Design a protein around this ligand. Structure first.
Ligand SMILES: N[C@@H](Cc1c[nH]c[nH+]1)C(=O)O
Ligand SMILES: N[C@@H](Cc1c[nH]c[nH+]1)C(=O)O
Ligand SMILES: [Zn+2]
Ligand SMILES: [Zn+2]
Lengths: 434, 431
């Protein structure tokens, strides 16, 4: 249906092989940047009045109260089925158990007698969460963001989403303890969280992906001093599946399609030692695609897919590590054995019964992951992103005295007399006193 | 001098007192650093050698410092220094090794195994400013964590000629390659790589305005590389009570001030008497510092503030979020819990900033300019990444299947839902 079939890796030239491992390039659109720039400055200078002006020309019912009332929340709540509410409770319980398990053990050591050094954590005081709106509300992200923030001890957690806000998002927010929910979206919401308005509190860090304007807004506020920090840069979503001859074509295909339906820009890749497996997966994908209700998105994403036949699993791992996929699914006989050799990936799924779908919703891991190659240096969203590491040290007189000569020597070597003098004064004071 | 009586200040005058300087970032340098990167990415080494002629008399030939050139430098250093550095490295190594994250491995539900593991950042490049007196201590601070993290490639760039202290330092911490390159071009070389300098995944280390600007740029490019953290002027804030020693407080403010003319120096104390004595001690000590023009210049921005009580010192400190916080009070340790924002904290009268900058073992590469609000001190974590792993058994998956379908269904993600149904049906037929 307008596309490729399979690629024999070793049949490609060294150059072509390097072109596949590369991801598409993004523009900059001098226009969107300028548009977003004016949006941010406007929101900072004219607050809620400015937000209502945008709400006006962007809606048939200009928003009045920015903060969703507690009454509107309880109403949305009752309208959801018990089935769905219970499903969310299961997801939150497992997400909570996994992230709670990431709490850093205390770091407290005496590098040498009398020289006590510690590392303690402090939560980011206030965080803002953004959730896109629309037809199909991806309320699960609310669970992924608010849960870790709650566990970290963040003092303030607020959320913005394009009005009207779905009952699922509102319920997901209440369930995770989100304190305030605001009727704002796009680059304006990011600006509202980053700068603050009469209604929206200024937060220290903003979490949550969005469209091109949300992404640009997050980039801009992270680069401004009067702005705020952000969770991570965005990029197209990806999935790489490593499958041997023992995998089930339909399982492989269902995972490639799950990722593909996340957007026309999703990158889906299959690495398999078996040409036969590749062919079967390609056909399963075609057959399953034909049953997908609204598969135009999935269809377009598949045009950039790559079903690669390799020499063996070792070459599969070599290729995967060079790529560093956001999601890595290992459907091979010795799945867990390979993990150790996996040097780069956002989140790994092992075996036939670990669908990407299980991780997006209820296994407990976070589905907010690095993509577009950022897997090379950034990590999966976790507890650490809602905290800060602070260092503390205390030297006793004895500890200080034994380290003094070393400090003076080094300070003197760097020609920083005042640093050296700070030690000398203390040393003489100690001789004196006793 | 000039003592500030905090509470006699208008609420506005107050925040204006602690406010940090503004930003220049003059387009002049934004462009200069830009065309510099492009050139390096297109014409690699040929570009680098063209930039050596310009800045500094080196006309660099071989970019990589030879092993023989390093051994010679090592021999020219005194035993006293070499031994000083071993103490530093040993302590730094001990503190960062202690930061290792114990592995996370749990079953959120029976048969649903979730783990968090760590992987090192593949390759990292370290930048060290040159000059007559180089702060070679930064080498120990960056290269030691990189060694502990298990980074496969660790390289360092520094303006030629590179002092012996830097070469020895690099070698002691196991840096693999040292390159005769600096400024905005050294950063571009690490981000894009050249025929001699390898492309790295993350770049660490502070430097002048051009280095700072190049890091920002390469961190904002798909073709570039990630960086450790944004830059800013260094800061020191001392909280001292009636029991503190004027000369000790002054020596810490001056330690920070002697770094650069933009250093922020701040004293908070509930005793006017103490503030006045500290100002006098600063005056006396200043007159004896050789390279003290900049220290005096930094002090033009200093603040000697008198608060009403100790609690108010903690309040102001938390609002500011200083890079270095020194607590010279009689119960320093107990105050720590109430400190919500600071880069590195020093407790008591025997914990001078100098100790932390050199051998206590903590890292002196800290977040500043208010970034302590969300950013952290450099540590092991900045040289690695967390990767999650999950494996659901047949039982675990079956116990979660319904939940996943219900959720996927609500988000209208059909393929996500069908991935579960396919598996549930397969299990039913094998049951
Ligand atoms: N795949 C989405 C997460 C998700 C939500 N629902 C299903 N999946 C992401 O990239 O964040
Ligand atoms: N005080 C410096 C580090 C330093 C290097 N040498 C002496 N001190 C800082 O943390 O910015
Ligand atoms: Zn998904
Ligand atoms: Zn210092």
């Amino acid at each position: 249906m307008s596309f490729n079939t399979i690629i024999d890796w070793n049949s490609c030239t060294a150059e072509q092989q390097r072109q596949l491992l590369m991801r598409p390039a993004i523009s900059a659109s001098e226009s969107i940047t300028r548009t977003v720039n004016d949006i941010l400055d406007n929101v900072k200078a004219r607050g809620d009045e400015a937000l209502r002006e945008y709400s006006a020309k962007f809606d048939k019912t200009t928003v009045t109260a920015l903060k969703v009332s507690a009454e509107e929340i309880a109403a949305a709540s009752e309208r959801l089925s018990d089935e769905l509410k219970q499903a969310m409770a299961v997801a939150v319980k497992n997400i909570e158990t996994f992230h709670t398990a990431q709490k850093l053990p205390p770091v407290d050591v005496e590098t040498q007698p009398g020289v006590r050094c510690q590392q303690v954590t402090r939560p980011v005081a206030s965080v803002g969460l953004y959730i896109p709106g629309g037809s199909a509300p991806l309320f699960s992200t609310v669970l992924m963001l608010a849960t870790p923030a709650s566990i970290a001890g963040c003092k303030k957690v607020v959320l913005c989403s394009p009005p009207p806000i779905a009952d699922e998002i509102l319920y997901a927010a209440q369930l995770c303890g989100v304190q305030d929910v605001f009727n704002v979206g796009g680059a304006q919401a990011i600006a509202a969280l980053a700068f603050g308005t009469e209604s929206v509190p200024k937060v220290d860090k903003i979490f949550g992906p969005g469209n091109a304007f949300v992404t640009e807004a997050k980039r801009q506020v992270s680069q401004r001093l009067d702005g705020a920090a952000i969770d991570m840069p965005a990029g197209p979503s990806e999935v790489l599946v490593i499958a041997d001859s023992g995998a089930t074509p339909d399982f492989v295909a269902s995972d490639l399609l799950s990722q593909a339906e996340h957007g026309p820009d999703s990158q889906v890749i299959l690495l398999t030692p078996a040409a036969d497996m590749a062919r079967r997966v390609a056909e399963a994908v075609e057959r399953q695609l034909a049953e997908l209700p609204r598969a135009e998105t999935a269809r377009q994403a598949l045009n950039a897919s790559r079903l690669i036949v390799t020499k063996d699993l070792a070459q599969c791992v070599e290729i995967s590590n060079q790529y560093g996929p956001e999601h890595l699914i290992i459907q091979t006989r010795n799945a867990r054995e390979l993990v150790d050799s996996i040097t780069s990936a956002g989140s790994v799924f092992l075996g036939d019964w670990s669908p990407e779908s299980a991780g997006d919703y209820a296994s407990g891991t976070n589905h907010v992951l690095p993509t577009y190659g950022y897997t090379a240096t950034c990590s999966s969203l976790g507890l650490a992103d809602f905290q800060k590491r602070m260092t503390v040290q205390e030297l006793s007189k004895e500890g200080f005295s034994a380290l003094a000569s070393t400090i003076e020597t080094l300070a003197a070597a760097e020609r920083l007399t005042a640093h050296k003098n700070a030690v000398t004064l203390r040393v003489n004071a100690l001789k004196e006193q006793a």
